Design an enzyme around this catalytic site. Structure first.
Site, PDB file in Angstrom:
ATOM      1  N   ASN A   1     -13.912 -43.065  52.378  1.00 23.01           N
ATOM      2  CA  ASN A   1     -14.296 -43.040  50.976  1.00 23.01           C
ATOM      3  C   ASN A   1     -14.235 -44.484  50.491  1.00 23.01           C
ATOM      4  O   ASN A   1     -13.172 -44.988  50.264  1.00 23.01           O
ATOM      5  CB  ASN A   1     -13.340 -42.144  50.199  1.00 23.01           C
ATOM      6  CG  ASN A   1     -13.560 -42.177  48.692  1.00 23.01           C
ATOM      7  OD1 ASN A   1     -14.579 -42.634  48.178  1.00 23.01           O
ATOM      8  ND2 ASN A   1     -12.587 -41.656  47.980  1.00 23.01           N
TER       9      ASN A   1
ATOM     10  N   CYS B   1     -20.710 -39.895  46.298  1.00 23.80           N
ATOM     11  CA  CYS B   1     -20.974 -38.489  46.035  1.00 23.80           C
ATOM     12  C   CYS B   1     -21.235 -37.745  47.298  1.00 23.80           C
ATOM     13  O   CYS B   1     -20.340 -37.580  48.071  1.00 23.80           O
ATOM     14  CB  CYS B   1     -22.085 -38.323  44.987  1.00 23.80           C
ATOM     15  SG  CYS B   1     -21.651 -39.238  43.478  1.00 23.80           S
TER      16      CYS B   1
ATOM     17  N   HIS C   1     -15.155 -33.080  43.829  1.00 23.12           N
ATOM     18  CA  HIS C   1     -14.760 -33.314  45.224  1.00 23.12           C
ATOM     19  C   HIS C   1     -15.831 -32.801  46.231  1.00 23.12           C
ATOM     20  O   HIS C   1     -16.302 -31.666  46.086  1.00 23.12           O
ATOM     21  CB  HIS C   1     -13.421 -32.631  45.488  1.00 23.12           C
ATOM     22  CG  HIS C   1     -12.870 -32.928  46.839  1.00 23.12           C
ATOM     23  ND1 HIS C   1     -12.366 -31.952  47.673  1.00 23.12           N
ATOM     24  CD2 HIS C   1     -12.786 -34.094  47.525  1.00 23.12           C
ATOM     25  CE1 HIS C   1     -11.985 -32.508  48.811  1.00 23.12           C
ATOM     26  NE2 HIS C   1     -12.238 -33.807  48.751  1.00 23.12           N
TER      27      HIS C   1
ATOM     28  N   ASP D   1     -13.767 -34.040  55.394  1.00 25.96           N
ATOM     29  CA  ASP D   1     -13.339 -34.432  54.055  1.00 25.96           C
ATOM     30  C   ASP D   1     -13.085 -35.924  54.126  1.00 25.96           C
ATOM     31  O   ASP D   1     -11.962 -36.358  54.174  1.00 25.96           O
ATOM     32  CB  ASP D   1     -12.097 -33.634  53.667  1.00 25.96           C
ATOM     33  CG  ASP D   1     -11.647 -33.866  52.209  1.00 25.96           C
ATOM     34  OD1 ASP D   1     -12.255 -34.681  51.470  1.00 25.96           O
ATOM     35  OD2 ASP D   1     -10.649 -33.221  51.818  1.00 25.96           O
TER      36      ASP D   1
HETATM   37  C1  LIG Z   1     -22.200 -38.484  41.922  1.00 21.43           C
HETATM   38  C2  LIG Z   1     -21.239 -37.284  41.849  1.00 21.43           C
HETATM   39  S1  LIG Z   1     -20.346 -37.453  40.304  1.00 21.43           S
HETATM   40  O1  LIG Z   1     -18.886 -37.167  40.637  1.00 21.43           O
HETATM   41  O2  LIG Z   1     -20.659 -38.832  39.776  1.00 21.43           O
HETATM   42  N1  LIG Z   1     -20.801 -36.150  39.135  1.00 21.43           N
HETATM   43  C3  LIG Z   1     -21.693 -36.364  38.137  1.00 21.43           C
HETATM   44  C4  LIG Z   1     -21.273 -37.014  36.994  1.00 21.43           C
HETATM   45  C5  LIG Z   1     -22.177 -37.217  35.937  1.00 21.43           C
HETATM   46  C6  LIG Z   1     -23.498 -36.771  36.060  1.00 21.43           C
HETATM   47  C7  LIG Z   1     -23.935 -36.104  37.201  1.00 21.43           C
HETATM   48  C8  LIG Z   1     -23.027 -35.850  38.229  1.00 21.43           C
HETATM   49  C9  LIG Z   1     -23.452 -35.219  39.393  1.00 21.43           C
HETATM   50  C10 LIG Z   1     -24.508 -35.784  40.072  1.00 21.43           C
HETATM   51  C11 LIG Z   1     -24.901 -35.215  41.302  1.00 21.43           C
HETATM   52  C12 LIG Z   1     -24.311 -34.073  41.840  1.00 21.43           C
HETATM   53  C13 LIG Z   1     -24.760 -33.614  43.105  1.00 21.43           C
HETATM   54  O3  LIG Z   1     -23.893 -33.619  43.982  1.00 21.43           O
HETATM   55  N2  LIG Z   1     -26.052 -33.381  43.468  1.00 21.43           N
HETATM   56  C14 LIG Z   1     -27.231 -33.295  42.543  1.00 21.43           C
HETATM   57  C15 LIG Z   1     -27.986 -31.862  42.736  1.00 21.43           C
HETATM   58  C16 LIG Z   1     -28.254 -31.643  44.228  1.00 21.43           C
HETATM   59  O4  LIG Z   1     -29.220 -32.682  44.633  1.00 21.43           O
HETATM   60  C17 LIG Z   1     -28.766 -30.225  44.527  1.00 21.43           C
HETATM   61  N3  LIG Z   1     -30.036 -30.019  43.798  1.00 21.43           N
HETATM   62  C18 LIG Z   1     -31.181 -30.476  44.364  1.00 21.43           C
HETATM   63  N4  LIG Z   1     -32.354 -30.355  43.659  1.00 21.43           N
HETATM   64  C19 LIG Z   1     -32.337 -29.722  42.461  1.00 21.43           C
HETATM   65  C20 LIG Z   1     -31.202 -29.245  41.939  1.00 21.43           C
HETATM   66  C21 LIG Z   1     -31.516 -28.648  40.768  1.00 21.43           C
HETATM   67  N5  LIG Z   1     -32.817 -28.793  40.575  1.00 21.43           N
HETATM   68  N6  LIG Z   1     -33.321 -29.423  41.608  1.00 21.43           N
HETATM   69  C22 LIG Z   1     -34.710 -29.781  41.853  1.00 21.43           C
HETATM   70  C23 LIG Z   1     -30.048 -29.389  42.603  1.00 21.43           C
HETATM   71  O5  LIG Z   1     -28.978 -28.945  42.161  1.00 21.43           O
HETATM   72  C24 LIG Z   1     -26.998 -31.767  45.053  1.00 21.43           C
HETATM   73  C25 LIG Z   1     -26.320 -33.091  44.927  1.00 21.43           C
HETATM   74  C26 LIG Z   1     -23.214 -33.517  41.155  1.00 21.43           C
HETATM   75  C27 LIG Z   1     -22.816 -34.094  39.924  1.00 21.43           C
END
Ligand SMILES: *CCS(=O)(=O)Nc1ccccc1-c1ccc(C(=O)N2CCC(O)(Cn3cnc4c(cnn4C)c3=O)CC2)cc1
EC number: 3.4.19.12
Length: 332
Positions: A10, A15, A250, A267
């Site tokens: 990490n 992410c 997480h 992890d």
């Molecule tokens: C970067 C993780 S974080 O701890 O900074 N959390 C965070 C904080 C603020 C704003 C956003 C987040 C955030 C960002 C990204 C995820 C995440 O893990 N993703 C994004 C969605 C993902 O690509 C699955 N997915 C793909 N395509 C999608 C959707 C929905 N609609 N479409 C087209 C979708 O969910 C998985 C990875 C979490 C939190």
């Protein structure tokens, strides 16, 4: 490690990156082909293909957690928010496109589309006249709706369901004018390695509903024409998981690397053996821990996709370059 496998450090708010990199590393046919790319002339910091070669080597040989900072620098996601503003499949594409492009003109040309590219038809059928239009599209991944869906089967049903084009979004049928019509999608082909993203994060909140996925997934019924010689049965290889609220989370990935149902949890720097229940059912959702991406492998392709990789599979020229870097670095 009582596992045999090494974790990734990490080092920063990356992410889903580490989970995605392990998933790719354990796509052995992809790993081998990556090792063959002619990176000898590449610049040692601006090359994404070289930087992918570097991480895989270390995941394969190191007894210590492996670093990723040269990798992230090489594709330019160096800011707090480049990871938070992209989807996991967008990162995968950034990675697999560099690599696919480097492979052009070599003996592994075509490996990436061979492994990940499927074909679908999108068709439009008018209701009051004879015009239909069918057009093929390529995909490297599929995004599945989960809101209101018990399970993967139902997400697929939803995915290929007929969508009306009436009243305000009437379809333009050319010489036939504006028309009521129905549209839908059908698979023509499904690739050897199937990446499914689960649409849990929507505009920006997380959906934690229960969504069930099986270890074995029969997809025949969503294909336009089936093949009795090669049926579209898939085996679950990886589960990428996010635990916690909308904001902050997480990230772990569960894999069964050899495809035998002996599962492991990754992890970051810690890797441990786990149960099948912890890898699968315990990520259905419904505490707030659950899958957002799944990797399945076509059963008839499993042996080739997961072909054993040995040390001999890395050309010495590349082993020498990575060694010289460890030695330049090792001078503190
Ligand atoms: C970067 C993780 S974080 O701890 O900074 N959390 C965070 C904080 C603020 C704003 C956003 C987040 C955030 C960002 C990204 C995820 C995440 O893990 N993703 C994004 C969605 C993902 O690509 C699955 N997915 C793909 N395509 C999608 C959707 C929905 N609609 N479409 C087209 C979708 O969910 C998985 C990875 C979490 C939190």
């Amino acid at each position: 490690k009582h596992t045999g496998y090494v974790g990734l450090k990490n080092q920063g708010a990356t992410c889903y990156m580490n989970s995605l990199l392990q998933t790719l590393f354990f796509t052995n046919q992809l790993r081998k082909a990556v090792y063959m790319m002619p990176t000898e002339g590449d610049d040692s910091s601006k090359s994404v293909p070289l930087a992918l070669q570097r991480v895989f080597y270390e995941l394969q040989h190191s007894d210590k957690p492996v670093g990723t900072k040269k990798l992230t620098k090489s594709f330019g996601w160096e800011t707090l928010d480049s990871f938070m503003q992209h989807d996991v499949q967008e990162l995968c594409r950034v990675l697999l496109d560099n690599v696919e492009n480097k492979m052009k003109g070599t003996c592994v040309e075509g490996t990436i589309p061979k492994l990940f590219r499927g074909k679908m038809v999108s068709y439009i059928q008018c209701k009051e006249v004879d015009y239909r239009s069918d057009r093929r599209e390529d995909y490297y991944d599929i995004q599945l709706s989960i809101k209101g869906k018990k399970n993967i089967f139902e997400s697929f049903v939803d995915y290929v369901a007929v969508e009306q084009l009436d009243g305000d979004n009437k379809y333009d049928a050319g010489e036939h004018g504006l028309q009521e019509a129905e549209k839908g999608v059908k698979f023509l082909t499904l690739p050897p390695v199937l990446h499914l993203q689960l649409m849990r994060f929507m505009y920006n909140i997380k959906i934690n509903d229960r969504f069930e996925f099986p270890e074995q997934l029969p997809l025949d019924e969503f294909l336009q024409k089936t093949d009795p010689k090669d049926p579209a049965n898939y085996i679950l290889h990886a589960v990428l998981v996010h635990s916690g609220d909308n904001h902050g989370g997480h990230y772990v990935v569960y894999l069964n690397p050899k495809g035998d149902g002996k599962w492991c949890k990754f992890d970051d720097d810690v890797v441990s053996r786990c149960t099948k229940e912890e890898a699968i059912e315990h990520n259905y959702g419904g505490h707030c821990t659950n899958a957002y991406m799944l990797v399945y492998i076509r059963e008839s392709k499993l042996s080739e996709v997961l072909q054993a990789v040995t040390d001999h599979d890395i050309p010495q020229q590349l082993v020498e370059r990575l060694q010289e870097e460890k030695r330049i670095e090792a001078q503190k």
